[model samples]
Target: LFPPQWICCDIRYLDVSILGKFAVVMADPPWDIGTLTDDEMRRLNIPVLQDDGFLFLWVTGRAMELGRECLNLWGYERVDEIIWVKTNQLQRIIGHWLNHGKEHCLVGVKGNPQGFNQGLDCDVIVAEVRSTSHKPDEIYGMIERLSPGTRKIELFGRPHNVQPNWITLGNQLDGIHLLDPDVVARFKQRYPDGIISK
Candidate 1:
């Protein structure tokens, strides 16, 4: 059984029944992130996830309807939700909704859950999603102060210097490539005929 303040790895593959007690599970399901469905997610590694686990899922509004599907698949139920509000520009963000500047963190408690510290105030907390899939260290940083030592696992990840208690998978910090006709003008010199060569 792992402690409540560190990130752990399970190379044996994520099985629902095997996750130990006091395990906090973090997952960023392939809710179609920027349309990249790589081999990692296509595999469908584990069976039903273990009960009695803390699951923090990063989801989108478009996929919110399907959130229940994930809960059924993982044997979980929606307890509460955490909102990530980015104080940055929304024009450039590629989302189903044009003005989408927020994401959802569905907090599902599997079976009888353990205690998690929660301070005064409210449920809605403002957060900023950094470059690409960057999860703002600021909010998660607050989690420590409230809950003391807690185990955190990030679902999708690129190479990043996150907290030692965070385990990230998938392409964490990889950037999205956009092709705009107007933006392509800047590359005219390189691809003279608008045809890129291999």
Candidate 2:
């Protein structure tokens, strides 16, 4: 389960200055038709990021151009891209380009971090889309493995169960359901006595 440090607040105005710095940061901000500018993205993350850190930004296919600029604004160079191939979970999405069935993750690096392996299984990762805007668990594993520091956090994270190691932040951060089935049952058994749902 997550610790007491997990916070729920509007990410745009969230005061990250008090959190010192972090080495690895993952973000899946609502693209909303690419309304967010590079300057805004830079302002949101720069203060919290360490000099040498890695940023895993989840971007939509339509907003690839915008994402690139944002990465540059945040003082990170494009290292490589990780593709989330929608296997059987492809939705019939209507777009100007095509029926969007895939998602792209931009891996931007700032300064230098240790243990960032270039050779992985492949750049394209195949996984079924479980829920709307919800990423596969495999992607999380890859990010954690490649990240140099243990102090990592997820922005715009799901309101599901808390992850033990990562700090989950989002607007809806109250009364979340447990991700693991076993943990859910355990919590329910001791619900009256005590439960850390918040």
Backbone clash count for every predicted candidate, in the order shown: 9, 0
* lDDT against true structure, model 1: 0.50
The stretch of ten residues in a row with the least summed lDDT in candidate 1 is 1-10
lDDT of 2 by residue, 20-132 (tens): 45667778877757245555655675534567777878887556877777888878898888888776645432168667767888988888776665465466778877778
Local accuracy by lDDT, each model:
0.50, 0.66
TM-score of each: 0.58, 0.74
* TM-score for candidate 1, residues paired by index: 0.58
- Candidate 1 on 1-198: residue-level lDDT in tens? 122222122322433222223345666665653343434333444223344556666677556756555654656677777776666445333355377666777877677755656453244655545576666665565555544465555555445534455434444343322233332343344446643333
